Amino acid sequence: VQLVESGGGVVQPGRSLRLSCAASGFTFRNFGMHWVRQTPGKGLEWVAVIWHDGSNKFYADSVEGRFTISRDNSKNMIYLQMNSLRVEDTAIYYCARDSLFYDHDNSGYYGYWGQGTLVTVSSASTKGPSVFPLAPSSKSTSGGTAALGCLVKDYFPEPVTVSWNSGALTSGVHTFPAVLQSSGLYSLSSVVTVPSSSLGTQTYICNVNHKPSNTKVDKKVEPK
């Protein structure tokens, strides 16, 4: 059993998009299919369900009138057409098959999932990040250990890669998951703890690379 989604990407709000999900390794015409979406913030949300023949369909209240689920039993496919997209529709969209075995008193759970495809509804345009120092100081030092880092602010889209001293510095590094700001631009911080002995005789440089905008920044971080 193999379910494979694709078709996602980045789109403006108010626009439209169609998703696809190929199904393999089981009798497709004998099962209803579902669309379920996941958000980092609202968790897992059911989207729609289509009968085994396309006969009956049901939609989540948040997408009724804007989303339409379809299937082709001769292609072993299932589609989802999204209309008048809102930024609140940004999620990972999974393909799910109803049931594990057939049963008419046991149905409505998802026996098999797809890997999922990501839909990003944003008005932001591609933009490189600005890199500011998280400079070490007396208030960044605890005992023999100092903290320093970089602030990779206001970029789009994901992801950015951050290294330290061109890969030489690995132990002690923490690159935090990016965060979506009220601007619609992403933002993260990378930090490292180093011995306070070396702040005078060791150069620390974070290497920020944002391939979506061909942006590469090296930033030396020295104490204040």
Partner 1 sequence: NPNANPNA
Partner 2 sequence: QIVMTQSPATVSVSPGERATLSCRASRSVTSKLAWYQQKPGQAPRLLIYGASTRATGIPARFSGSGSGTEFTLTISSLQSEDFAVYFCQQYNNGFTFGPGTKVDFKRTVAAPSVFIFPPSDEQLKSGTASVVCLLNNFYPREAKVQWKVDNALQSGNSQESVTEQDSKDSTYSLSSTLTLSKADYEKHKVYACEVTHQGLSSPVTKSFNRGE
184 scored as a contact of partner 2 (CB under 8 A): no
Q: Enumerate residues preceding breaks in the chain (C to N > 2.5 Å).
A: none
Given the structure tokens 């990003």, which residue do they identify? 120
- Of the candidates 158, 164, 173, which has an alpha carbon nearest to the alpha carbon of residue 124? 158
Tell me the per-residue interface mask from 15 to 54 with partner 2, x by CB under 8 A, - otherwise. -------------------x-x------xxxx--x-----
Residues 68 and 79: beta-carbon distance below 8 Å: no
53 binds, among partner 1, partner 2, none (CB under 5 to 8 A by kind): partner 1
* CA distance linking residue 154 with residue 219, whole number of Å: 16
* CA distance linking residue 79 with residue 71, whole number of Å: 6
181 scored as a contact of partner 2 (CB under 8 A): yes
Q: In angstroms, what is the minimal distance from the CB of 195 to partner 2?
A: 14
DSSP one-letter code for 211: G
Three-state secondary structure call for residue 8 = coil
**Segment near partner 1 (CB under 8 A), from 1-9, 28-36, 137-145, 158-166?**
28-36
Q: Give the one residue of 1, 2, 16, 29 binding partner 1; rule: CB under 8 A.
A: 29
Three-state secondary structure call for residue 197 = helix
Q: Give the one residue of 20, 107, 165, 193 binding partner 1; rule: CB under 8 A.
A: 107
* CA distance linking residue 117 with residue 115, whole number of Å: 7
29 binds, among partner 2, partner 1, none (CB under 5 to 8 A by kind): partner 1
Going by their DSSP bridges, the two strands 9-11 and 117-121 should be labelled as: parallel
Q: Please name every residue paired with 98 in a beta bridge, in sequence order, or none if there are none.
A: 110
102 scored as a contact of partner 1 (CB under 8 A): yes
66 binds, among partner 2, partner 1, none (CB under 5 to 8 A by kind): none
Residues 34 and 108: beta-carbon distance below 8 Å: no
Q: Give the one residue of 120, 140, 163, 207 binding partner 2; rule: CB under 8 A.
A: 140
Tell me the per-residue interface mask from 133 to 172 with partner 1, x by CB under 8 A, - otherwise. ----------------------------------------
- 24 Ramachandran zone, left/alpha/beta (phi>0; psi -120 to 50): beta
- Which chain residues interact with partner 2 by CB under 8 A? 34, 36, 43-46, 49, 61, 94, 100, 106-116, 130, 132-135, 137, 139-140, 142, 145, 147, 149, 151, 153, 174, 176-179, 181, 187-189, 191, 193
- Which chain residues interact with partner 1 by CB under 8 A? 29-32, 49-53, 56, 58, 98-99, 102-104, 107-108
